[PDB]
Design a protein around this ligand. Structure first.
Ligand SMILES: *C(=C)C1=C(C)[C@@H](Cc2[nH]c(/C=C3N=C(/C=C4\NC(=O)[C@H](C)[C@H]4CC)C(C)=C\3CCC(=O)O)c(CCC(=O)O)c2C)NC1=O
Ligand SMILES: *C(=C)C1=C(C)[C@@H](Cc2[nH]c(/C=C3N=C(/C=C4\NC(=O)[C@H](C)[C@H]4[C@@H](*)C)C(C)=C\3CCC(=O)O)c(CCC(=O)O)c2C)NC1=O
Ligand SMILES: *[C@@H](C)C1=C(C)C(=O)N[C@H]1Cc1[nH]c(/C=C2\N=C(C[C@H]3NC(=O)C(CC)=C3C)C(C)=C2CCC(=O)O)c(CCC(=O)O)c1C
Ligand SMILES: *[C@@H](C)[C@H]1/C(=C/C2=NC(=C\c3[nH]c(C[C@H]4NC(=O)C(C=C)=C4C)c(C)c3CCC(=O)O)/C(CCC(=O)O)=C2C)NC(=O)[C@@H]1C
Ligand SMILES: *[C@@H](C)[C@H]1/C(=C/C2=NC(=C\c3[nH]c(C[C@H]4NC(=O)C(C=C)=C4C)c(C)c3CCC(=O)O)/C(CCC(=O)O)=C2C)NC(=O)[C@@H]1C
Ligand SMILES: *[C@@H](C)[C@H]1/C(=C/C2=NC(=C\c3[nH]c(C[C@H]4NC(=O)C(C=C)=C4C)c(C)c3CCC(=O)O)/C(CCC(=O)O)=C2C)NC(=O)[C@@H]1C
Ligand SMILES: *[C@H](C)[C@H]1/C(=C/C2=NC(=C\c3[nH]c(C[C@H]4NC(=O)C(C=C)=C4C)c(C)c3CCC(=O)O)/C(CCC(=O)O)=C2C)NC(=O)[C@@H]1C
Ligand SMILES: *[C@H](C)[C@H]1/C(=C/C2=NC(=C\c3[nH]c(C[C@H]4NC(=O)C(C=C)=C4C)c(C)c3CCC(=O)O)/C(CCC(=O)O)=C2C)NC(=O)[C@@H]1C
Ligand SMILES: *[C@H](C)[C@H]1/C(=C/C2=NC(=C\c3[nH]c(C[C@H]4NC(=O)C(C=C)=C4C)c(C)c3CCC(=O)O)/C(CCC(=O)O)=C2C)NC(=O)[C@@H]1C
Ligand SMILES: *[C@H](C)[C@H]1/C(=C/C2=NC(=C\c3[nH]c(C[C@H]4NC(=O)C(C=C)=C4C)c(C)c3CCC(=O)O)/C(CCC(=O)O)=C2C)NC(=O)[C@@H]1C
Ligand SMILES: *[C@H](C)[C@H]1/C(=C/C2=NC(=C\c3[nH]c(C[C@H]4NC(=O)C(C=C)=C4C)c(C)c3CCC(=O)O)/C(CCC(=O)O)=C2C)NC(=O)[C@@H]1C
Ligand SMILES: *[C@H](C)[C@H]1/C(=C/C2=NC(=C\c3[nH]c(C[C@H]4NC(=O)C(C=C)=C4C)c(C)c3CCC(=O)O)/C(CCC(=O)O)=C2C)NC(=O)[C@@H]1C
Ligand SMILES: *[C@H](C)[C@H]1/C(=C/C2=NC(=C\c3[nH]c(C[C@H]4NC(=O)C(C=C)=C4C)c(C)c3CCC(=O)O)/C(CCC(=O)O)=C2C)NC(=O)[C@@H]1C
Ligand SMILES: *[C@H](C)[C@H]1/C(=C/C2=NC(=C\c3[nH]c(C[C@H]4NC(=O)C(C=C)=C4C)c(C)c3CCC(=O)O)/C(CCC(=O)O)=C2C)NC(=O)[C@@H]1C
Lengths: 164, 177, 257, 52, 177, 164, 164, 177
């Protein structure tokens, strides 16, 4: 997994030296986002149950032909299955913004993602309409401070630059 | 490795004798449907996109707990490596079809899968449910009775071809038991 | 037509006499305008030798985290001696015999064409650039763990199936009863045992792979020796299919080992 | 493959025992639609409301 | 060119093919009594929209409990899905008359209809009662012994094709029996 | 080029051997198959402009949603590119008939086509719907032999089970 | 052991794929030769106990230095076991005509033959005499047909080119 | 690498054009003589061990200085390395005959071989006579004019490949000297 701690603890062992004082400087930088990033995790964990609907309804407005037959949204199960599908990606941004890295996403979300979408014919450009709608929705005065607006909005832009 | 041409030469190495007009007639009939065997792998390579696809969905629509929390094919690191687990057994069976025997299959890949599968924790019980989904669609494309894709062949009987592909997949369950 | 005539350029190579000239003026006139492309295609293949050795370390560092495969140190400063032994021997292998020069070239232009599975763009690069094919082999044969340090035995018999082939593989090292300079431990007063003390660390922790890392390497080594040595030798494939450490310790190059 | 079906058209030749270039025959595969319009006039002409 | 005709239906995506004035003579040389056959299948598809209306309504006229609340001809989208399906057999058994054989009728239409209908709550004894109306309706159009409408044909007999389509509707009936 | 001639000389080169007579049997299979394969390519060289126009009309009939903005068919210059994108396939299908193998297809058109189609948001679902219309309405006794209608149609579905 | 169609599938998994369209073009060509070559196997089959003793004493008619002691050809049962050593070279050259290729030849007739003929001092020139003694009398319109007459010798001179 | 069928489309790929009946007839005559082409490479592989052992003493019969002390061909190893050098550049021209194109030897054997012979001191005035000796033996086998070997071939002319085999030999010495 990727984080601030486990990345810099690797090069201590993989070069065969002790814990330095430069890696001790690195966890100090994790303290400056510990009370600055984790407010967004408790934000969305009590907020997904209404935004799984409005961001699940966001893509079918762009792509009404998935309801159309012989397509990714040929039948209700993918969408009902389809709503469960999108509740795994930002289920991991609750796991990513609690750790400090993209660990729960680069090993559980993108690894093998383009290969189960070509074979099972799921159009990857509807996930770009699914959770990037929340990027165009986010209000820094009302919902949460601009520290989530620079970090929750960053981790989403990791994903659209991965499913494309 | 060795073919059905060599399958009587498997026996002939331990004969202290030869193969002549005693056993060519079993190989002479293999040529008489040699057009047919090359005509009955042209259906199998014609639907490579769907055969590993609907197979792994054939167990999801029956046993859906394998993608539950506590699953073997939970995330995309696992199930994208499950479609590679299920495609290369469609690969070493089509090599065995043009050879007439499982000499390619039973030694290159299946030589002891119960030290790579029980060493991982792979569910063997619904692996064989993932086998007969492809076997029932292998005999269904040998005959032209697939309800979706009709294929234009020369007419004739292929029950010896349809029974042989079921007798390739049977020892797959034996290699995991 | 362009002008009143079209003479050849004086910048074209092989334009002067070179018949009864001095040695200084002979060599100046045969390499007239050829020096540029010799140095263009000298930094070309050295960049290719630098590029594929990067593209296989991306598997060694998946998603920005280092695995147990890197591990260049175990004790305090355990890479400084590994720094010297890797770069001093790289000069030792550049003063080899003139028979092993093209033996390295033509065999690197043998195995890479096999491993590049029928991609016509890729075999065209491997014929012009000998440095690329020397880097294509040792990168891929260390990306997929196949050479010596990771294919550990699991039975009790396979430790002698390893030991039968390797001391017979070292017929390539000793030409006769003399040794060679290609197989040298080191050249400092501790560097002999300083090669041993890392040699047991790299074998030990590489026996601590995951269940996926051993079961995917035990079939990649099998088909590796099945298309590098036993092209049709089904008896050698009868040990290469079920016993993969036999199919891995045997090295495809004339490494002089 | 759900409610998919063939569809065929017939134009016979104009006169008997003469060759006709205008005679032509479709065999186009076409998905049969839901047809809600005559579903209303058949349920209302037979039974009751149908509004469950 | 019946095998190329069969690939318009079986290939699992919609194409189009049509027959001009030259290759209409190719069809008459191929299919025996094709001028009796193409007159027969034209006299089913031209009046199929009336044929589906009397077929579902006679099911109401001898069993009016289908249009009851809780019935299977209640809630008119459900009543429309009968009227979708009622021509789907007549689209396919017209195609069984055209190919001369009901192989393409079996796997694409009849295969799985028995287990689908008990999954959805279809009463199966009314479903044989619907198709038996359409069995009696087609033979009054092939023999032109229909009471209301009549068609124009060259004179002769077509009772072999009337028995040929009667061997196609009981394949629909015994599949859902 | 992955032709049958190359596959039997590459295994001959790897074994350090001569041309053995086991490969000569495979060359005898070419001149039997070459007459029933070249006239599939000769009829394709005289029909390519009429077949590539008739192909793309079912691409927009099965999926008519591409004329929307943001899709890959909103303006005329890239609908012109769509016919060029699909003519390049049906030229490489002509090129591989003359060689006899799948050599030009899996190297020129195929290798690298996955990671540029999802890059530029092109679905392969409309790419395979273009040639499957071409591969279907072609009567095996009406245009060419009963052998070329098998061998050439075996090359068109090679694209479909490599793209899906 | 390398024959016509076990080779082209040994290279078909060497890239990790399925059979191609030219992979089947190779298997048609031995079918073009599975009649012209199986007659040549039958001619050796019902004549092998006539040719073991015919070409057997042929080499003994060459080398008079084996007939005196100082060799492994002193007594009778060596010459009886010599006629056994003839029978193995006709057992596997009959096998290759059944499968088409040089499969059974390279394993136990070609590879490893150097050690147990040179450290055992049984000269390879003595073997190639009786090998050519079968090769210098092919009565082409009498014993077989014209195409069996040219490929029967093509398997005969394989041990010529290897062992001598 | 690049055989004859690949060659005719790689110079037509830069055309951005199809390959119709303008140059396919030149390729249709290539598969006409393909039965004679397999009746040409059979005459080279069948006599390999003679003709490689031939020129290694036929070179030194003209130049006896190569066996002298201080010779390139002086010891047992430098001859044992010379004979295994000897059939490599003739097994590759057999590849070019069987594949119809010279694009397998000039990238895997003539790929900088004048580079390596200067690094060892291998003479080149001998290395081109040692392949011209092994050249006339290759036109005296595809045309049955050998004086100690006769291959029974049908009636026909073999000047089609007599200059073409030597065309795969004069390019050898030109790009290694
Ligand atoms: C040295 C003074 C000297 C020789 C030694 C000898 C060698 C030699 N032979 C040729 C020509 C041929 N060699 C051939 C090979 C064989 N002939 C056979 O019949 C068997 C099958 C095989 C040996 C196993 C053939 C077919 C030829 C061509 C016909 C011919 O015999 O002339 C040459 C080439 C001569 C030249 O340079 O043109 C040489 C050097 N000859 C010597 O002079
Ligand atoms: C009760 C309300 C009710 C019925 C009972 C049922 C009557 C019924 N009618 C038939 C027979 C036919 N229906 C036909 C269909 C048509 N005739 C036409 O000319 C147009 C084109 C089309 C639609 C009106 C035909 C051709 C027949 C056979 C001849 C005939 O007219 O009788 C049946 C089936 C035969 C049987 O009785 O077993 C039934 C049950 N409809 C009701 O509304
Ligand atoms: C994992 C396989 C690695 C990749 C990829 C890589 O570039 N380096 C590996 C991991 C790694 N190693 C270090 C530090 C050292 N490595 C050393 C050996 C090299 N130095 C040499 O002169 C030679 C001979 C060519 C080699 C191989 C040495 C020495 C060190 C320094 C040890 C020390 O005392 O500091 C590091 C840490 C450095 C960094 O920031 O990358 C890593 C990640
Ligand atoms: C509509 C929003 C989408 C769409 C969604 C569908 N996904 C379907 C199956 C599916 N999806 C994934 C990806 C996702 N689900 C996971 O469980 C995980 C990992 C934790 C990820 C990344 C997977 C792995 C699967 C298969 C197994 C499963 O169902 O969980 C699906 C049903 C199709 C089917 O599998 O039969 C739908 C409708 N599909 C669309 O067309 C748009 C893009
Ligand atoms: C194309 C005609 C082939 C083909 C190409 C693929 N190569 C893939 C990976 C890969 N390729 C190379 C060689 C290439 N990379 C270079 O940097 C250079 C020259 C300096 C060359 C010639 C390498 C080293 C790699 C490994 C990449 C990595 O380590 O990340 C590839 C992806 C699949 C794979 O990894 O094998 C493809 C598709 N392969 C084909 O299928 C056709 C026939
Ligand atoms: C397959 C058995 C072929 C065959 C190949 C030949 N190998 C030759 C020498 C040689 N080969 C190897 C590797 C191979 N030998 C082994 O014992 C094992 C595994 C236990 C393998 C993979 C080695 C190490 C050697 C050196 C000599 C020796 O074994 O002591 C060879 C001679 C030519 C050469 O020396 O390069 C051949 C022909 N031999 C056969 O007969 C079948 C067809
Ligand atoms: C049984 C499962 C099938 C069926 C099989 C038949 N196929 C027959 C003939 C046939 N198929 C091919 C094509 C195939 N051979 C090749 O060499 C290549 C590619 C290089 C391919 C794709 C050929 C060439 C032939 C022979 C036709 C000819 O040579 O002119 C066939 C008739 C032969 C026989 O009866 O033995 C049959 C019965 N046909 C069926 O109806 C079921 C569904
Ligand atoms: C033409 C359609 C080409 C092309 C031609 C260019 N050549 C340029 C420079 C240049 N070319 C040569 C070779 C020429 N000189 C000779 O003496 C002989 C043969 C005896 C030949 C073929 C030389 C030596 C030079 C260097 C200039 C000189 O020495 O005079 C050139 C660029 C000129 C410049 O840099 O200003 C061009 C454009 N290039 C093309 O794009 C097409 C393919
Ligand atoms: C009315 C006289 C019947 C009756 C009919 C119903 N059928 C319903 C659904 C349905 N029918 C089929 C079969 C048919 N449609 C096709 O597209 C194809 C072939 C491609 C065939 C053979 C299918 C496949 C389905 C629906 C499932 C699906 O889409 O795959 C239906 C709807 C059920 C519901 O809404 O609950 C009805 C009412 N049912 C009756 O009770 C009378 C006897
Ligand atoms: C059977 C259900 C009918 C019936 C059929 C007969 N039709 C006869 C001749 C005939 N039929 C047609 C129309 C048909 N031929 C076509 O090419 C096409 C469309 C592509 C269709 C629909 C024509 C044009 C003809 C020839 C008329 C003429 O000579 O001008 C026929 C006579 C024997 C025969 O030719 O097969 C019969 C018996 N007639 C009946 O009595 C029942 C009710
Ligand atoms: C086949 C069972 C159908 C059928 C369909 C029709 N196709 C018509 C024209 C047409 N077909 C093709 C594909 C074919 N021609 C080729 O040149 C090649 C490849 C070399 C193939 C696979 C093309 C390209 C065309 C256009 C040529 C033209 O202008 O005709 C066609 C005529 C059009 C029409 O009348 O609707 C039909 C009916 N043909 C049949 O006979 C059965 C019914
Ligand atoms: C039409 C039925 C398709 C479709 C096609 C588009 N392709 C676009 C760009 C494009 N396509 C390729 C691959 C193609 N070019 C080649 O040279 C070869 C073979 C050698 C092939 C298969 C490339 C490399 C490119 C980019 C460069 C270029 O445009 O020439 C394209 C434009 C997208 C864009 O440029 O942003 C379209 C519209 N798209 C469709 O709507 C259907 C599915
Ligand atoms: C052929 C070039 C001559 C010819 C020579 C004669 N051979 C005679 C007998 C004979 N021939 C063979 C070889 C043959 N028998 C086999 O079983 C096989 C391979 C399967 C072959 C090639 C043998 C072993 C024998 C001895 C046993 C016997 O009597 O057949 C022969 C008979 C009289 C004699 O010379 O002793 C002749 C004349 N025959 C021809 O017509 C052309 C000129
Ligand atoms: C010129 C190089 C020769 C010569 C050659 C001719 N060979 C002719 C026919 C022929 N050759 C073979 C055997 C060949 N075909 C194979 O499949 C294999 C191995 C697998 C080999 C070695 C056959 C089968 C045939 C056809 C005759 C038959 O079917 O029995 C031939 C006549 C055909 C033509 O002219 O195109 C010629 C001229 N003949 C010569 O005069 C020189 C010496």
């Amino acid at each position: 997994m990727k984080s601030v701690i486990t990345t810099v603890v690797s090069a201590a062992d993989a070069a065969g030296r002790f814990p330095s004082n430069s890696d001790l400087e690195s966890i100090q930088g994790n303290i400056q986002r510990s009370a600055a990033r984790l407010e967004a995790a408790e934000k969305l964990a009590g907020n997904h149950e209404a935004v799984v609907k409005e961001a699940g309804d966001a893509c079918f407005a762009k792509y009404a032909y998935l309801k159309n037959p012989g397509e990714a949204g040929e039948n209700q199960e993918k969408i009902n299955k389809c709503y469960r599908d999108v509740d795994h990606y930002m289920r991991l941004v609750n796991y990513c913004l609690v750790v400090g890295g993209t660990g729960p996403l680069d090993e559980w979300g993108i690894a093998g993602a383009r290969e189960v979408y070509r074979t099972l014919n799921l159009p990857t450009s509807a996930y770009v309409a699914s959770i990037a709608y929340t990027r165009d929705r986010l209000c820094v005065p009302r919902d949460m401070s601009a520290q989530a607006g620079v970090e929750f909005s960053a981790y989403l832009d990791y994903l659209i630059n991965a499913l494309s | 490795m060795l073919d059905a041409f060599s399958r009587v030469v498997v026996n002939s190495d331990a004969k202290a004798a030869y193969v002549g007009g005693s056993d060519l007639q079993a190989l002479k009939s293999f040529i008489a449907d040699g057009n047919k065997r090359l005509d009955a792998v042209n259906s199998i390579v014609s639907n490579a996109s769907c055969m590993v696809s609907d197979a792994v969905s054939g167990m999801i629509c029956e046993n859906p707990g394998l993608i539950s929390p506590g699953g073997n094919c939970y995330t995309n690191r696992r199930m994208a490596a499950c479609l590679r687990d299920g495609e290369i057994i469609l690969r070493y069976v089509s090599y065995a079809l043009l050879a007439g025997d499982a000499s390619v299959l039973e030694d290159r890949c299946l030589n002891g899968l119960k030290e790579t599968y029980i060493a991982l924790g792979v569910p063997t019980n619904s692996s064989i449910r993932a086998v007969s989904i492809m076997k029932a669609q292998a005999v269904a494309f040998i005959t032209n009775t697939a309800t979706e894709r009709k294929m234009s062949f020369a007419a004739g009987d292929c029950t010896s071809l349809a029974s042989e592909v079921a007798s390739y997949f049977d020892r797959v369950g034996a290699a995991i038991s | 037509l362009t002008g009143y005539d079209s003479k050849s350029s004086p910048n074209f190579p092989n334009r002067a006499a070179t018949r009864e000239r001095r040695t200084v003026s002979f060599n100046a006139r045969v390499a007239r305008n050829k020096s540029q492309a010799k140095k263009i295609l000298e930094k070309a293949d050295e960049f290719f030798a630098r590029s594929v050795t990067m593209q296989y370390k991306a598997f060694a560092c998946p998603n920005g985290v280092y695995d147990i495969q890197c591990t260049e140190g175990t004790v305090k400063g355990a890479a400084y001696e590994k720094r010297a032994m890797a770069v001093s021997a790289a000069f030792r292998a550049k003063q080899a015999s003139p028979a092993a020069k093209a033996r390295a070239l033509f065999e690197n232009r043998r195995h890479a064409i096999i491993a590049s599975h029928e991609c016509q763009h890729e075999e065209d690069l491997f014929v012009r650039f000998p440095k690329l094919s020397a880097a294509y082999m040792m990168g891929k044969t260390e990306a997929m763990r196949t050479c010596s340090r990771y294919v550990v035995p699991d039975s009790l018999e396979e430790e002698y199936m390893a030991a039968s082939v390797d001391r017979q593989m070292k017929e390539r090292a000793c030409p006769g009863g003399v040794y060679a300079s290609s197989c040298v431990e080191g050249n400092a007063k501790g560097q002999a045992e300083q090669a041993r003390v890392a040699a047991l660390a790299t074998a030990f922790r590489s026996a601590q792979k995951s269940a996926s890392k051993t079961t995917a390497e035990r079939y990649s080594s099998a088909a590796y020796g099945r298309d590098h040595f036993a092209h049709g030798c089904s008896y050698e494939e009868s040990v290469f299919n079920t016993y993969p450490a036999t199919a891995a310790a045997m090295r495809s190059k004339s490494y002089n080992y | 493959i759900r409610n998919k079906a063939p569809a065929m058209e017939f134009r016979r030749p104009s006169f008997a025992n003469t060759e006709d270039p205008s005679a032509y025959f479709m065999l186009q595969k076409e998905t049969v639609p839901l047809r809600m319009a005559l579903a209303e006039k058949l349920l209302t002409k037979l039974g009751r409301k149908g509004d469950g």
